[PDB]
């Protein structure tokens, strides 16, 4: 109970299950994270954008593969 | 091994083993200390 919300020390000191619930729901609110600067904010958003586009392309590739393999195209 | 055996090899693997190991890792991580 001292290292899940790495981005928030206030949550990491919560002795209740609320820490786990709030750790999920505040993970992407980068502006509210501990030890936060603007440069790190924009860089993390940039990397998250890259990962997101990768996820989209992987989803499309999966649709294509499953139509090619198990479909009747 | 034919291609039609891949569903029976993978669906149990993913849908049961991956939850087990993922739960183990996530529980261990969220129950850590400092």
């Amino acid at each position: 109970v001292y290292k899940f919300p790495k981005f928030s020390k206030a949550l990491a000191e919560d002795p209740s299950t609320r820490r786990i619930w709030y750790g999920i729901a505040t993970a992407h609110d980068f502006e509210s994270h501990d030890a936060m600067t603007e440069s790190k904010l924009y860089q993390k958003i940039f990397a998250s954008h890259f990962g997101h586009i990768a996820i989209i392309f992987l989803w499309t590739a999966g649709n294509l593969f499953h139509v090619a393999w198990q479909g009747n195209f | 091994m034919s291609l039609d055996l891949l569903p029976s090899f993978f669906v149990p693997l993913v849908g049961l083993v991956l939850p087990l190991f993922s739960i183990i890792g996530l529980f261990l991580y969220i129950e850590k200390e400092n």
Partner: peptide, 30 residues
């Protein structure tokens, strides 16, 4: 109908994309 070689190498390439994903995941820190 695609062959075993076609599916196998796609699985291998998918593994490589997985190792690249954890490297990005670990680089975005714990």
């Amino acid at each position: 109908m695609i062959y075993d070689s076609q599916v196998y190498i796609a699985l291998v390439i998918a593994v490589v994309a997985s190792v690249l994903a954890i490297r990005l995941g670990a680089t975005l820190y714990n």
